[PDB]
C-alpha cells in the first residue's frame, strides 16, 4: 500500500536488494559451482507473506 510503515519498507528494500542476478565473475572462481542466483523472486509469481 502507498501508506506503509518504515519497517515494512525496510524489509521490502532488503528483498529488492536480494532479488538480483548473480555476478558473472563469480563463475570463474576456483571450485565455484553456482551458475545463477537460484533464489530469484518474481513479484507476480511468488509473494512475500509479510
Amino acid at each position: 500500500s502507498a501508506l506503509k510503515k518504515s519497517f515494512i519498507k525496510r524489509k521490502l528494500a532488503k528483498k529488492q536488494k536480494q532479488n538480483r542476478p548473480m555476478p558473472q565473475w563469480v563463475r570463474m572462481k576456483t571450485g565455484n559451482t553456482m551458475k545463477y542466483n537460484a533464489k530469484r523472486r518474481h513479484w507476480r509469481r511468488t509473494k512475500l507473506k509479510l
Partner: peptide, 9 residues
C-alpha cells in the same frame, strides 16, 4: 533541506 528515503532504504 528536503529529505526522502528511497525504495532501497
Amino acid at each position: 533541506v528536503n529529505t526522502l528515503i528511497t525504495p532501497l532504504q
